[PDB]
């Protein structure tokens, strides 16, 4: 018993078109070869799919139930082919890697250099951190890689964790180029602040030591990026990841406005979930737990 | 693109032994042949779906998920031809009717004895309904005519309706020695009660009353013939439509106990989705709306 | 903390009218009382969800995405009380039983009266068997005790089985007034045959012997019932189940016509997933298990 | 019907240990108290959910089913109040906006530069958009406003769209010391590319002109940010939004390449799904339109 794709997407059009030369013609095969197709699908599924004696064409009540098991067979396998297209377009070699983005754009550019060109050479597909389900999309194979932060459940069994790197948010303001910050926590009045959403874990983290200064929120988001750009228009200050703002420290274009008791912990991890990766799997999660 | 669904086949056995000689035999094929198979279905879906520089051969990441693809598809081309070989041994006037057990053993005997021979005698199939899934089995084709009560989604369009009768849901108990009913309404306390699920529309009818008669639930259930052998074993009083105790009511094996308040009225139909049905398909419509 | 679903119906009533009074009187609560009600559902949800000094009354953010929530809340209570709502009804010692209807209506019965020799008799909710989802069904608990037909799914671990009984699938045909065979096999001619759908159990049991008789196919349905009221119709001939026509085989109505190896055996068995059921459970459990 | 959500966590807690005592002190209540809170949620759900008379303490089926919905209901008690904890730190002025990463990084800025001193002046809430739920979150209320890219649904009815910007997606590479482009279309061999996930909008641009240039996908990512840091790393080439390296083109960094068949056109807008917003998120809607 073989079922040839085309074979549904012929009786699918004759189906529509209720008419067998017609039916070739859009399809672009000749109208015996198109007869001939459909007369071998009936045998391969064992009934007469068409009555073919009457003019327009009816369906059989077995062409009428075959008719919607085609139409999911051709849905299935479009959406089984758009499943592997960016897996296949990379290769065998391909590591699906789930990342926060600041994370990501911190941690693949160094890991991206560290590969050797041989014929397990990673090749990278790093896809933004889906907040709510990336335990789950862990699980299912999604993907192979979590990029993320310091996570009760996915730091625990059934999945495996790897700290990468603990550092520090760090208030910042920017600076004037006689590179001194614009804002302070010295006033009397609060200071605009540039806020992340209070349950994000970053935004745990700065709830931790709000009472210990004035803020007025000013501007939301889940984007270290956003608030880092915010910062760098003089829009306000913000806890900033300390691997977000290296140029910007080294340079003058923002400083360190607080205590050192502002200053406050992250750790950031790798996840997996799949006890034994495909050989490339197994590189970029050996690279990434030896990030010099 | 063109799959062949014994590629689909080749590449499961393949995934679950794991070299190819193995799996050849396991397909009853040689091996360049088989080589051949599983490449073709490497280059139609465009993708590596092994990697053949490993014993065991293992799936790449593009064959571990097409291997669930194929899965489905196998299981969907094999469930679809089963299907098709029910229907196509019954003949090209089979009638596909989804029906109440109740309904469908009280109005099929006669349907059957309306049947005329001729080139589109009707030939029935009837299957025991789902509400949840009837309505998009008469939408997608999957059966003809539904035999089912009043409904208030298929009664408006894009279905047809055609109301069959209204009777009435009669509250019996079985009668004693030659007459008389062993349980009553008058009657001290509450009496034993089969009733129907609460969600059907049978125990929906019965709640409308609920608060005018003392009840003491008993047995529940959603079959009516259940309810009914239950009052004949005189195990208590059930709400049954009248066409089911006919002849119970005429013999004195049952009788109404209740006032006509009592007595809750039931509407049945036949309902239909598609406008224009093979001939054997108008033919079993036409009888139904006739059925008087 | 504490959040009443009057308050979350409360909310959602004024966010439709907009106007306090109003929702008010449809919430059959004083003026007031309402505005209380509402300023004490914002005190635990711990924001102003309503603008009060405006007309008309403008929800605030907070209070849009808390409609949401709200709606969720209450048609999830809505469903968890509808679930309930039949187990409920009977108590603590509702057994849910899934079953085919002709072993529900050959069982239940016999069970019944078992419940009688032995004081305290539990409920019994007796819902007839959707194979297709069955075995899902008793996993997820929908269902307490599965009666059914021999499966080799629920046979075998992770579910727990026990044959009831062994029977046979008898060809039978109507019988005249003075008693013989309508139908027959002796005549090298076809007969009317009344089946199951072959992909049934009944249905595969009844391929085996296929082609040791010469049958054409008049009706299909998967209700036993539904072929024994046709086959006393004199419409054909069926395999009907051995414990569904012992009367009419006493009252020699109906009548075996095949060679005893047309006589094919069947089993039914009762299934469960659960370790432990509630005592009524396990009593009806056991009853099942003995039924002898 | 009043259910409350602390009798959930009664029930709940009970649940889990099966000690009243131990349940009580660990809801923080007096015995009798802790029971009458029980019976409490019992008789507003009409139901015995636990049995008492067996130890240790097991549920009622009804308890068992209701488990689940009381662990759902305060699960989503508990992510409702939380989804209101972030936005009630907030004003009433805050507007929820909804945005791809790099559109955020683009618009938002000038955006927050444009807003004026008043009663109603906005305040942001930025969160990066994921576009299989973007609609949804637009529908019931959750945003406000969406910045992303042309969409065939959001652009309709019943939406409201706003054409922000036409620009393209430039095909560039970084140059060297000198310079000159390290990678070009003139070159020899496929070119080391850096492309979207192919279902993505911006990769569903380049699949247009895949043909006209020899690529070699050696990394994949729905982040524009992360192709542009590997661009400027000199890894390969990418299409990158006009709009995303304009600093980078004016200065030495990076230099479009190729062709002007290669430039992509690319559209982005403001959809929105309420007619009337609150003042801020209407001026914020204003602002939008008149980026030009």
């Not at 003019?55 to 849905?75: C, D, H, M, Q, Y």
């Not at 754009?105 to 090749?123: R, V, W």
């Not at 789950?136 to 495996?160: H, M, N, S, V, W």
């Not at 926590?185 to 030591?209: C, D, H, K, N």
Request: hydrophobic share 40%.
């Amino acid at each position: 018993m073989n079922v040839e794709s085309k074979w549904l997407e012929d009786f699918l059009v004759l189906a529509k078109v209720k008419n067998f030369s017609q039916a070739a013609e859009l399809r672009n095969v000749t109208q015996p070869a198109f007869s001939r197709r459909i007369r071998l699908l009936e045998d391969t599924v064992g009934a007469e799919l068409v009555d073919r004696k009457s003019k327009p064409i009816e369906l059989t009540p077995s062409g009428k139930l075959f008719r919607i098991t085609a139409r999911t067979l051709v849905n299935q396998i479009e959406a089984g082919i758009s499943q592997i297209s960016d897996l296949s377009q990379l290769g065998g070699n391909v590591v699906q890697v789930a990342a926060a983005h600041s994370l990501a754009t911190s941690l693949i550019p160094k890991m991206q250099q560290a590969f050797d060109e041989g014929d397990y050479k990673p090749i990278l597909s790093v896809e933004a951190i889906d907040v709510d389900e990336a335990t789950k999309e862990l699980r299912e194979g999604a993907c192979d890689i979590l990029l993320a932060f310091d996570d009760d459940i996915l730091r625990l069994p059934p999945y495996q964790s790897q700290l990468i790197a603990k550092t520090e948010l760090l208030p910042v303001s920017a600076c004037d180029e006689m590179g001194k910050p614009i804002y302070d926590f010295i006033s009397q009045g609060a200071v605009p602040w540039l806020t992340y959403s209070s349950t994000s874990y970053m935004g745990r983290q700065v709830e931790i030591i709000r009472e210990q200064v004035a803020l007025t929120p000013i501007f939301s988001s889940s984007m270290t990026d956003m608030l880092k750009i915010l910062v760098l228009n003089k829009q306000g200050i913000a806890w900033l990841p300390a691997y977000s703002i290296q140029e910007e420290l080294a340079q003058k274009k923002v400083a360190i406005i607080g205590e050192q008791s502002l200053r406050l912990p992250i750790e950031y991890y790798a996840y997996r979930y799949q006890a034994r990766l495909h050989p490339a799997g197994e590189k970029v999660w050996s690279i990434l737990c030896n990030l010099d």
